[PDB]
Design a binder for this molecule. Structure first.
Ligand code: MET
Length: 522
């Protein structure tokens, strides 16, 4: 099936201004999207805001502002933040959007009509801040901001008791089918240890899920249950549905939603190929969402990838401050290189300088300038290579192999491993150049310099191609410099070694340009 490659971020609670971590979550989505476009696929990257609910209403109340004006305000800050971050996101969805509301009601009725919703009670614990139901096994003693109280073991936020007559979803009726799913498709959750988590959790057992709430308790800031106005639809069913809505909106060039199609198939987007989420919101995506879709008879997503950060809680680092100080591409690169799947990373100013200088400036930067220098490349062109020594071939072989391995990494997706894979190959090219001493060759042996300079150029191109989803602005400056024609800057075709042919002319130089400039160690 050729289809639109559909990738998502989570949609974020608008309770507080956007910080790092939304930025991280959405950057991953952006990168995954960007890569598939570099492959020449159709993409649809979605992101947005989660605007309804108790959490969000009570933040609006605590600021003495109306929910309508509050959400709109904060949503605008999220849009400004993401514009400023220079993502290539295809659409920004809001759950207040009337077309979304329409899809939630539509979905609820599917779920209702299958007989997977019934009127019951939920008498148990709830984290308003997580908008999560919790069994007593996942609460414990702690402090309110300072009295003694019970808190979520998930997040350490304050939980409270809840005894409401609610509409209930038959999640228990879906235990075995989730379990078949998980096993049948072992790629479906990334990273592997969270897949194991999700299975152990569901093995142990699933109770039914309370998919409505008394309207009094939600401050009437939510979507009403179809055919029962005394209730509102659980904020997470509302939130998760953003993906299905997203998959059905027609969007103009300006980024404005213009139409909601009846059948998701019409746009060939649903289901999501990859859902980017933080580890704090796994259950909702890996248990609830599949159960809802299986009820509605909808297709399940292909991949849920849950990165190592929290999606929401501010537990100092301002992206825009750091982006101005170090660079937008540098910051994105640093965040992506440093953060693994279980997050044990160093985000100190010292480390950011070490990597910017070490990797981007010394390994990539230097190398780009060597092969384009007037000193070495005296014709500002791609020379035609002579015969290859077994060293020459050793590196060519690395450069040939890099797209295959970088691709697989991107498809996991483990963007960090992908970056390493490339930079390994960059460090090889430096090593190569150190040996050959191209500076010495331009006098000694011009015939050899051709072979050397050609391989350098083509490695630096192919590495920069595979780096392009991470360093989107700089890859354009690298290609401009190497004089790579615009057609050769994307497509699986141009992952092949030698796509840009000899006798191509390098880009014009500038009197004081440097690609990445070192920052003092202080
Ligand atoms: C359907 S994703 C919803 C995520 C939630 N709004 C959060 O910020 O964590």
């Amino acid at each position: 099936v050729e289809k639109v490659f559909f990738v998502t971020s989570p949609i974020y609670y608008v309770n507080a201004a956007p910080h790092i971590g939304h930025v991280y979550s959405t950057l991953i989505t952006d990168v995954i999207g960007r890569y598939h476009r570099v492959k020449g696929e159709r993409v649809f990257a979605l992101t947005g805001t989660d605007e309804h609910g108790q959490k969000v209403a009570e933040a609006a109340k605590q600021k003495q502002v109306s929910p309508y004006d509050f959400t709109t305000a904060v949503a605008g800050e999220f849009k400004k933040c993401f514009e400023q971050m220079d993502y290539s996101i295809d659409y920004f969805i809001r759950t207040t959007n009337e077309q979304h509301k329409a899809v939630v009601k539509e979905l609820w009725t599917k779920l209702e009509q299958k007989g997977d919703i019934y009127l019951g009670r939920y008498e148990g614990w709830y984290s308003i801040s997580d908008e999560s139901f919790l069994t007593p096994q996942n609460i414990t003693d702690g402090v309110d901001k300072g009295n003694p109280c019970k808190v979520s073991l998930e997040s350490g936020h304050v939980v409270t008791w809840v005894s409401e007559e609610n509409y209930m979803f038959r999640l228990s009726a879906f235990r075995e089918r989730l379990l078949e799913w998980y096993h049948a498709n072992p790629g479906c959750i990334v990273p592997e240890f969270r897949r194991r988590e999700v299975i152990r959790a569901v093995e142990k057992g699933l109770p039914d899920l309370s998919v409505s709430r008394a309207r009094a308790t939600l401050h009437n800031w939510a979507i009403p249950v179809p055919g029962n106005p005394d209730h509102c639809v659980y904020v997470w069913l509302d939130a998760l549905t953003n993906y299905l809505t997203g998959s059905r909106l027609r969007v103009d060039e300006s980024g404005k939603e213009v139409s909601l199609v009846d059948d998701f198939n019409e746009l060939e987007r649903f289901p999501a190929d990859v859902h980017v989420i933080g580890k704090d919101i796994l259950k909702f995506h890996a248990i609830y969402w599949p159960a809802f879709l299986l009820s509605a008879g909808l297709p399940l997503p292909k991949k849920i990838v849950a990165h190592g950060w929290w999606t929401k809680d501010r537990k100092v680092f301002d992206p825009v401050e750091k982006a101005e100080e170090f660079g937008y591409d540098a910051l994105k690169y640093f965040l992506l290189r440093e953060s693994g799947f279980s997050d044990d990373g160093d985000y100190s100013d010292k480390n950011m300088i070490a990597r910017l200088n070490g990797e981007l400036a010394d390994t990539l930067g230097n190398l780009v300038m060597r092969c384009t220098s007037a000193k070495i490349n005296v014709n500002g062109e791609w020379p035609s290579p002579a015969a290859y020594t077994e060293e020459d071939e050793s590196l060519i072989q690395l450069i040939k192999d890099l797209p295959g391995t970088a691709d697989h990494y991107y498809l996991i997706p483990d963007i960090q491993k992908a970056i390493i894979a490339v930079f390994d190959v960059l460090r090889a090219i430096n090593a190569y150049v150190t040996d050959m001493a191209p500076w010495k060759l331009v006098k000694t042996d011009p015939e050899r310099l051709r072979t050397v300079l050609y391989i350098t150029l083509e490695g630096v191109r192919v590495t920069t191609l595979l780096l392009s989803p991470i360093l989107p602005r700089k890859s354009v400056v690298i290609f401009d410099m190497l004089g790579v024609p615009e057609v050769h800057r994307k497509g699986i075709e141009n992952f092949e070694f030698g796509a840009v042919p000899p006798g191509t002319r390098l880009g014009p130089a500038v009197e004081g340009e440097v690609l990445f400039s070192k920052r003092s160690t202080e």
